[PDB]
Amino acid sequence: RMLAAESSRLLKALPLKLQQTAFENAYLKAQEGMREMSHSAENPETLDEIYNRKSVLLTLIAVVLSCSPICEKQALFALCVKKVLEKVSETFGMASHLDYLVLEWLFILLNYTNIEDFYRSCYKVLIPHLVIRSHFDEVKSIQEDWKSLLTDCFPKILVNILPYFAYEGTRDSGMAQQRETATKPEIVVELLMTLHEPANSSALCDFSGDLDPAPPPHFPSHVIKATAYISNCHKTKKSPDSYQKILLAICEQAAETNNVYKKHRILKIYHLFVSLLLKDIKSGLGGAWAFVLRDVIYTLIHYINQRPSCIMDVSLRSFSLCCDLLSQVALENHLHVIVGTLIPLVYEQVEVQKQVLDLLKYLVIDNKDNENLYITIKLLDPFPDHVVFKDLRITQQKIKYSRGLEEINHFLSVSVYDALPLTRLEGLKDLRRQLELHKDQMVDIMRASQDNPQDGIMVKLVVNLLQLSKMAINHTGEKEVLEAVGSCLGEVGPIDFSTIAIQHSKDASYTKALKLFEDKELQWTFIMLTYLNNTLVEDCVKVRSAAVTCLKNILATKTGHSFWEIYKMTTDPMLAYLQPFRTSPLSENHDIWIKTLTCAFLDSGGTKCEILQLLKPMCEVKTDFCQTVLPYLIHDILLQDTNESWRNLLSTHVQGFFTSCLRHFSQTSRSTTPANLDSESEHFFRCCLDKKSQRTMLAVVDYMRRQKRPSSGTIFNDAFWLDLNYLEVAKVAQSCAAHFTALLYAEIY
C-alpha cells in the first residue's frame, strides 16, 4: 500500500514505491520465513525488482550463500500463473524447478514446456514430483490430498514403476514441504576499553539519507551488519513421518526391502548430502535436516537387522560422522546417545571408543543434560559386557570422570584399571594402549606423570634395555606429540611436558612405521593388493562427505575382478565387513600419447607452488592416460576428487604401475619427467614436502618400482624403475634431509 502510495517525486516514488519497497525488502531480508519470494515475485510483478536490486540483494546472497535463497526460494518459487509470475529469473537468475513444477498433473501444463527444454525431461523430473506425488500419494494415505493424489494417480500413465524401483532418490526429502514446510587491564589501558553506554550517548545525511534511500546502501549494510554469539542454538535445536512411513506399503515397505538391499548407503550418503549446505541450520535447515536426520536416524533407527545387514557401521560410521558432525559442534546429539542404545548393535567396536572418545570430547565440556546424556552414554558405557574393549579404551574416562563424574567413569575406569593395578609396562602398555583414538586424549600424561611417579621400573625399563624398541613409546608419545601438532591444545605439549622424565633413552637414531595389518594385508599380492591397500586407502575414507564420492568409485572398485580379489580379500578385513556389506567386472578406456603428460613435468614439477598444483599435475598424472590398471582409472576421477596426495600416494604406485605399464615411455619420459623433480632441486628452488611427496615416489621406486624389471642390485631393478639420479635425489634427499632415506637415497646415490 505505502508502495502503491507511490520525476523527482517518481524518483521519490522510486524511493517511496520502490526504494521503500527495497527498504521493505531489508526486513523480508531481515527476519525469517522471509517469503519475499512472494515479495520478489511482486517485486518483479510490481517491477519493484527492476532496480537490479538483486545486486543490492546480492548482499543478502552474500549474507546467504550465493543464490542460496534463490535456490531456497524454489519452494516458494514453486509456490509462486504464480509461477508465470515466478518466471522472472529463468534466464534472470531449470529442470528440477520443472521437476518441482512437474505437479501440473495432480500435467502437460508442465509437460508442454518440457519439450521447450526437451520432451524426454519426463525422465528428468521423474522422481522429484513423483516424490511430491508420492508425497501426495503418501498424502493420499491421509483426503483432499488424495484428490490431487488421485489426480496424481492419473499422472501414472507413464512407465516409471520400473524407475520406481530406482526410486527413493528423494525418499524422505520432503519431510517439511508436505509436513511443516520450512517450519521455523593495563592493556585495556594500552589497548582499549569497550564503549557501550553513554560513551554511546556521546554520539547531514542529505544526499546521505538520499544515498541511504539511493544505493539502498545502509539497510542491507544494516541487514548485513547484524550478520554475533557462539551459542547452543542447535543444542537448543511436520508429520509426514506417518506419510513417510505410509507409502512404503505401496510396494510393501521396499524401504524395509532396500534397507540392506539398496543398503540405503546412497540414501545414507544422500542423507549426508542432504545435510550439506545449511546455514539455516540453527534450528533450521540443517537443524531441521538434523531433526530430519535425527528422525531419519530415528527412522533408520527402526531396522534391527537389514540396516546392520546393509552394514550397521556403514551406517553407524555415519553416526560417527554424525558424531563427527556432532563433534563438528545438537542436544539432538542425544539421539546418537539414544542410538547408543544400539543393543542389537551390542557387539559394536571402538568406533564406539572413538565415539566414546568423541563422547569424552564433550565430557566436561558438555552441558549438564548433554553431560547427563553423556553420563547416560557413560551409563550406557557402565554396561558390563565386552568390558575389556571398554577397559581398553577406558583410560581417559577416569580423567574424564575425574574432570567431573569424579569416580563415575574413574571407578569404572578404575574398575577397568582394576583389571589389575599393573603399571610399569602395563601403563606403558596402557600407553601402548594409549594408541587408539584422535587428537586429544590428553589424559594419561597425568597418568604418565602418575606413572612417572613410579620410577622404579625405569630399572625395568633399564632392564628392558636388551631390546630394539619401546622407549619409542616415547617416540610414540613423540609421534603422538607430533600427532595433532597443528591441532589445538598445545597443553598437550605441556602434557608432553609430563614426558620430562626423559632424555635418557638409546639404541636408535630415528622413528618407525606401522600397519602390520598392511603387512598382514601384504598377504595380498598384485597391485590389486595395492588396490586392496588402496582399498584401505579407500577404507581410509571412513571419512567424509564429498569425499563421499569415491564410495561409488569404491563400489566401482567393487568390480568382480577386484571383487574377486576382494572376495579373496573378503576373508580377512574388518572394515571390509562394512564394505562388502556396503560395496560388493568393469570397463576400461584408450588413449593416444604416452607423451601426453610429458611437458607437464614442468607442472608435474609442480613448478608453481600449491602442489595441489603438482597434484593437479598429479591429476595430470591421472590425466596422463593409460591403464596398467583400470583400477587405477577406477579412482582416477574420485582420485582427482581425493586428497590428491592420498591419491598421489598411489600415483607413484600408479606411476610404478604406470612405470610397470610404461615400456619405453616413462622409461624415456621419466628420464625427462623425473629429471624435473631432479631439476626441481635446481638453484635451491622452492618445492615442499610434496617435493617430499615427489620424492616419496622414490619409495615406491625404492619399494614398489623397486620391483621394476627386477634386478640384483634392486637398485638395478629400481634403476630399472629409475630415471635414476639419486645423486640428484641426494640433494632432494638432502632437501628431504631425512637421512635414512636420504642416506639410502644417497647410498643409492
Nearest to 703 by CA among 743, 655, 735: 655
Angle among Cα 168, 173, 176 to the nearest 5 degrees reads 145
User: Residue 382 is placed in which grid cell?
Assistant: 557402565
Residues whose CB falls within 8 Å of the CB of residue 391, separated by 6 or more in sequence, listed in order: 415, 416, 417, 419
Nearest to 174 by CA among 121, 122, 135, 205: 135
What residue has cell string 488424495? 146
Q: What is the CA radius of gyration of the chain?
A: 31
For the chain, the maximum distance between any two Cα atoms, rounded to a whole number of angstroms, is 98
User: Residue 85 is placed in which grid cell?
Assistant: 509470475
Cα separation, 72 vs 66, whole angstroms:
11
Per-residue DSSP letter, 342: -
Residues whose CB falls within 8 Å of the CB of residue 668, separated by 6 or more in sequence, listed in order: none
Cα separation, 521 vs 660, whole angstroms:
21
Contacts 24+ apart (CB under 8 A), 462-466: 465/506, 465/507
Resolution in A: 5.7
Nearest to 220 by CA among 57, 42, 65: 57
What residue has cell string 492419473? 154
- DSSP, collapsed to helix, strand or coil, labels residue 125 as coil
Cα separation, 573 vs 523, whole angstroms:
12
Cα separation, 672 vs 24, whole angstroms:
65
HEC string for 514-550: CCHHHHHHCCCCCHHHHHHHHHHHHHCCCCCCCCCCH
Residues whose CB falls within 8 Å of the CB of residue 144, separated by 6 or more in sequence, listed in order: none
- DSSP, collapsed to helix, strand or coil, labels residue 113 as helix
Method used to obtain the model: cryo-EM
User: Residue 626 is placed in which grid cell?
Assistant: 593409460
Cα separation, 545 vs 563, whole angstroms:
24
Kindly provide the residue ranges of all beta strands, DSSP E only, lying in 362-460, ordered along the sequence: none
Per-residue DSSP letter, 739: H
HEC string for 618-665: HHHHHHCCCCCCHHHHHHHHHHHHCCHHHHHHHHHHHHHHHHHHCCCH
* Inter-CA distances, 306 with 311, 317, 338, 384, 579, Å: 8, 16, 19, 27, 15
* Inter-CA distances, 279 with 55, 179, 287, 395, Å: 21, 21, 9, 37
What residue has cell string 614398489? 704
Angle among Cα 125, 129, 134 to the nearest 5 degrees reads 135
Decide if 440 contacts 484 (C-beta within 8 A): yes
Residues whose CB falls within 8 Å of the CB of residue 230, separated by 6 or more in sequence, listed in order: none
Nearest to 527 by CA among 557, 570, 501, 556: 557
Helix extents (H) in 169-217: 175-178, 186-190, 206-211
Cα separation, 17 vs 67, whole angstroms:
25
Cα separation, 313 vs 324, whole angstroms:
14
For the four alpha carbons of 726, 730, 735 and 736, in that order, the dihedral sign comes to positive
